[PDB]
Amino acid sequence: WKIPPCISNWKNAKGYTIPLDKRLAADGRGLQTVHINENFAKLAEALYI
Amino acid sequence: IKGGVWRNTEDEILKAAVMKYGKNQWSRIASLLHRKSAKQCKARWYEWLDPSIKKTEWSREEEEKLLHLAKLMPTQWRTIAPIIGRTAAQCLEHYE
Amino acid sequence: KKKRKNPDLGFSDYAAAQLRQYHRLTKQIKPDMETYERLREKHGEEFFPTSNSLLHGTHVPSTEEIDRMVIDLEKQIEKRDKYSRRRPYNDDADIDYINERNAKFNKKAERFYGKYTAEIKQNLERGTAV
């Protein structure tokens, strides 16, 4: 039940200096995983043919 | 009357200003660097200083996926670039 | 020859630490039987009281008793004051803070998020690569 400290992307009330790995620990935009579909292939191939 | 080549002093001040202000205050960072604007600071960060940007040598499977996607989505490097995991400028340069 | 090992686990409770502290203090104390049997022979039947006996408002401790109590309590206060041992301050680590509170916040951040932000640290040291 321990709560980690909030490191915000917006607010820095006491003007601290936070290490870059800590500052960019936004995992959701690293696990978002832009995954392509397989129907682009049919389109591209049919257009070249 | 802004911009030009990026020197190393400006990049280290850019990193320290990211460490103090974050990635959503680029106009506070650009008041710390003269001859660079907020858009230029942000562009420089996301294109050469973000520590996810793989600056190593291209592998074989990356360039296979590159040729597949570049035949698959013509001139769409901002769309290809998050899929193959490199910056779109790196991606376009290596494709050419 | 005897042998005993007593380490501690984590915190878990302000009452478990109390109980550990109490067992330490209560093993350390040694009774003097002379005063004990003196008071026993003096008080007689009421020396084994119940909840409602009568003796609640009567006892007056002689100066040596209260001196022993105050000495014990000062030892206890000192042992409590040594609770957070100050880790030594090396200045060879590349500092990462512009302030004194900033350093302790970065330490708490390395406690909590140090297990996760370990690839990005490797990127930052190798030249923002991989």
Curated annotation (Swiss-Prot), chain A:
Covered range of the whole protein: 245 to 293 of 536
Function: Involved in pre-mRNA splicing as component of the spliceosome. As a component of the minor spliceosome, involved in the splicing of U12-type introns in pre-mRNAs. Required for the specific splicing of CDKN1A pre-mRNA; the function probably involves the recruitment of U2AF2 to the mRNA. May recruit PPIL1 to the spliceosome. May be involved in cyclin-D1/CCND1 mRNA stability through the SNARP complex which associates with both the 3'end of the CCND1 gene and its mRNA. Involved in transcriptional regulation. (Microbial infection) Is recruited by HIV-1 Tat to Tat:P-TEFb:TAR RNA complexes and is involved in Tat transcription by recruitment of MYC, MEN1 and TRRAP to the HIV promoter.
Family per similarity comment: Belongs to the SNW family.
Organism (species): Homo sapiens (Human)
Name of the protein in its database record: SNW domain-containing protein 1
Subcellular location: Nucleus
Top-level taxon of the source organism: Eukaryota
Position of the Glycyl lysine isopeptide (Lys-Gly) (interchain with G-Cter in SUMO2) cross-link: 14, 42
Subunit relationships: Identified in the spliceosome C complex. Associates with U4/U6-U5 tri-small nuclear ribonucleoproteins (U4/U6-U5 tri-snRNPs). Component of the minor spliceosome, which splices U12-type introns. Interacts with SKI, SMAD2,SMAD3, RBPJ, RB1, PABPN1, MAGEA1, SIRT1, FOXN3, U2AF2, DAXX and ATP1B4. Interacts with PPIL1. Interacts with VDR and RXRA; preferentially associates with VDR:RXRA heterodimers. Interacts with NCOR2. Interacts with MAML1. Interacts with NOTCH1 NICD; the interaction involves multimerized NOTCH1 NICD. (Microbial infection) Interacts with human papillomavirus type-16 (HPV16) E7 protein.
UniProtKB/Swiss-Prot annotation, chain B:
Description of post-translational modifications: Phosphorylated on serine and threonine residues. Has no effect on subcellular location nor on homodimerization. Phosphorylated in vitro by CDK2. Phosphorylation enhances interaction with PPP1R8.
Subcellular localization(s) per the UniProt record: Nucleus; Nucleus speckle; Cytoplasm
Tissue note: Ubiquitously expressed in both fetal and adult tissues.
The HTH myb-type domain, residue ranges: 1-51, 52-96
DNA-binding region: 26-49, 77-96
Described function: DNA-binding protein involved in cell cycle control. May act as a transcription activator. Plays a role in pre-mRNA splicing as core component of precatalytic, catalytic and postcatalytic spliceosomal complexes. Component of the PRP19-CDC5L complex that forms an integral part of the spliceosome and is required for activating pre-mRNA splicing. The PRP19-CDC5L complex may also play a role in the response to DNA damage (DDR). As a component of the minor spliceosome, involved in the splicing of U12-type introns in pre-mRNAs.
Disease as annotated in the protein's UniProt record: A chromosomal aberration involving CDC5L is found in multicystic renal dysplasia. Translocation t(6;19)(p21;q13.1) with USF2.
Subunit (UniProt): Homodimer. Interacts with DAPK3. Component of the precatalytic, catalytic and postcatalytic spliceosome complexes. Part of a spliceosomal 'core' complex consisting of CDC5L, PLRG1, SPF27, CCAP1, CCAP3 and CCAP6. Interacts with PLRG1, Lodestar/TTF2, and NIPP1/PPP1R8. Component of the minor spliceosome, which splices U12-type introns. Within this complex, interacts with SCNM1. Component of the PRP19-CDC5L splicing complex composed of a core complex comprising a homotetramer of PRPF19, CDC5L, PLRG1 and BCAS2, and at least three less stably associated proteins CTNNBL1, CWC15 and HSPA8.
Membership in a protein family: Belongs to the CEF1 family.
Name of the protein this chain belongs to: Cell division cycle 5-like protein
Curated annotation (Swiss-Prot), chain C:
Location of this chain's protein in the cell: Nucleus
Chief location bin: nucleus
GO biological-process terms attached to the record: embryonic organ development; gastrulation; in utero embryonic development; mitotic G2 DNA damage checkpoint signaling; mRNA splicing, via spliceosome; positive regulation of cell population proliferation
Tissues expressing this chain: Abundantly expressed in the heart, skeletal muscle and kidney. Expressed at lower level other tissues.
CC terms in the record's Gene Ontology section: catalytic step 2 spliceosome; nuclear speck; nucleoplasm; nucleus; post-mRNA release spliceosomal complex; Prp19 complex; U2-type catalytic step 2 spliceosome
GO molecular function: RNA binding
Position of the Glycyl lysine isopeptide (Lys-Gly) (interchain with G-Cter in SUMO2) cross-link: 30, 121
Swiss-Prot/TrEMBL keywords: Acetylation, Coiled coil, Isopeptide bond, mRNA processing, mRNA splicing, Nucleus, Spliceosome, Ubl conjugation
Role played: Involved in pre-mRNA splicing as component of the spliceosome.
Quaternary structure annotation from Swiss-Prot or TrEMBL: Identified in the spliceosome C complex. Interacts with CCNDBP1.
Protein family membership: Belongs to the SYF2 family.
Stated name of the protein: Pre-mRNA-splicing factor SYF2
Source species: Homo sapiens
